[PDB]
Design an enzyme around this catalytic site. Structure first.
Site, PDB file in Angstrom:
ATOM      1  N   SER A 171      21.564 -16.371 -70.354  1.00  0.00           N
ATOM      2  CA  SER A 171      22.431 -17.507 -70.074  1.00  0.00           C
ATOM      3  C   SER A 171      23.865 -17.009 -70.234  1.00  0.00           C
ATOM      4  O   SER A 171      24.168 -15.916 -69.762  1.00  0.00           O
ATOM      5  CB  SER A 171      22.013 -18.693 -70.976  1.00  0.00           C
ATOM      6  OG  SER A 171      23.038 -19.651 -71.196  1.00  0.00           O
TER       7      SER A 171
ATOM      8  N   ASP B  54      14.866 -21.678 -61.856  1.00  0.00           N
ATOM      9  CA  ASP B  54      15.979 -21.972 -62.729  1.00  0.00           C
ATOM     10  C   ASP B  54      16.841 -23.058 -62.088  1.00  0.00           C
ATOM     11  O   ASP B  54      17.283 -22.876 -60.947  1.00  0.00           O
ATOM     12  CB  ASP B  54      16.803 -20.707 -62.942  1.00  0.00           C
ATOM     13  CG  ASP B  54      17.734 -20.772 -64.140  1.00  0.00           C
ATOM     14  OD1 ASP B  54      18.286 -21.835 -64.389  1.00  0.00           O
ATOM     15  OD2 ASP B  54      17.948 -19.708 -64.758  1.00  0.00           O
TER      16      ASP B  54
ATOM     17  N   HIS C 175      14.831 -21.854 -66.686  1.00  0.00           N
ATOM     18  CA  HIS C 175      15.933 -21.091 -67.254  1.00  0.00           C
ATOM     19  C   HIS C 175      15.555 -20.292 -68.506  1.00  0.00           C
ATOM     20  O   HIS C 175      16.196 -19.254 -68.775  1.00  0.00           O
ATOM     21  CB  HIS C 175      17.086 -22.071 -67.513  1.00  0.00           C
ATOM     22  CG  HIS C 175      18.405 -21.472 -67.855  1.00  0.00           C
ATOM     23  ND1 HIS C 175      19.028 -20.537 -67.079  1.00  0.00           N
ATOM     24  CD2 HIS C 175      19.277 -21.760 -68.883  1.00  0.00           C
ATOM     25  CE1 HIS C 175      20.236 -20.275 -67.574  1.00  0.00           C
ATOM     26  NE2 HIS C 175      20.419 -21.031 -68.694  1.00  0.00           N
TER      27      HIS C 175
END
Length: 260
Positions: free
Chosen positions: A130, A176, A207
């Site tokens: 991330s 995602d 994700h």
């Protein structure tokens, strides 16, 4: 010329642990970042490189911690961090990642530390999920001496990572919704012109598809370890596993360029 351990196999890379015994400690006074756990091999047979791993937005160490023993058992000192705030953005995360590597270097010089004399401070790598992934790419752009980057579902406001000259593996997560593959991971991958690079998209993934507890740890761990051993150690015994398409039904898009 930094070989540690035997020639690898698929099986030995897919296993939950490599050849080295792993111990760990928690950093007593984290300097420049929120918290850290240091994983290290007791018996690697020589100094090893260091890797700093950063979590995602809103997330804590637990989200990426599985990488700590996995990588350390193949011959790395690995620091998994909490950021100063769960809401730190990519630039901040990059600074904190580098601060974590810096404190690992200090502790390598500290006779009271379990990692005294265990680290080759010239051989460092960066990882994250991330925004921790976007931070890792920033780190690599600002510090081109880093030996490797392995990121998962990276997040940044920009896709312009032409600045990354370090060997970089990107794990993407097919479904995602936070960092869509077509508008984030693939443009980031395609922006890099100057480097060994690889893109591996996990089928059906959200994700969090490369995080602690994921369904694909044998595959993901093999590839992350292989990339780090190949590039952080210049160990061409790992060329096979670093560069290959891994012939997995759990890989829904695979690309690589300039790999050796």
């Amino acid at each position: 010329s930094h070989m540690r351990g035997p020639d690898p196999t698929a099986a030995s890379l897919e296993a939950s642990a490599g050849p080295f015994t792993v111990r760990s400690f928690t950093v007593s006074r984290p300097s420049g970042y929120g918290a850290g756990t240091v994983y290290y091999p007791t018996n690697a047979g020589g100094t090893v490189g260091a890797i700093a791993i950063v979590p995602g937005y809103t997330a804590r160490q637990s989200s990426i911690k599985w990488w700590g023993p996995r990588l350390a058992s193949h011959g790395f000192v690995v620091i998994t961090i909490d950021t100063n705030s769960t809401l730190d953005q990519p630039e901040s995360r990059s600074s904190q990642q580098m601060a974590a590597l810096e404190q690992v270097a200090s502790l390598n010089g500290t006779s009271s530390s379990p990692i005294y004399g265990k680290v080759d401070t010239a051989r460092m790598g960066v990882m994250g999920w991330s925004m921790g992934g976007g931070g890792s790419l920033i780190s690599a752009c600002n510090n081109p001496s880093l030996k490797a980057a392995v990121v998962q579902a990276p997040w940044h406001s920009s896709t312009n990572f032409s600045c990354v000259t370090v060997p970089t593996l990107i794990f993407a997560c097919e479904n995602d919704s936070i960092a869509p593959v077509n508008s984030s991971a693939l443009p980031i991958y395609d922006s890099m012109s100057e480097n060994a690079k690889q893109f591996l998209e996990i089928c059906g993934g959200s994700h969090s598809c490369a995080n602690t507890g994921n369904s694909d740890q044998a595959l993901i761990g093999k590839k992350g370890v292989a990339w780090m051993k190949r590039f952080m150690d210049n160990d061409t015994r790992y060329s096979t596993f670093a560069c290959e398409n891994p012939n997995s039904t759990r890989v829904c898009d695979f690309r690589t360029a300039n790999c050796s």
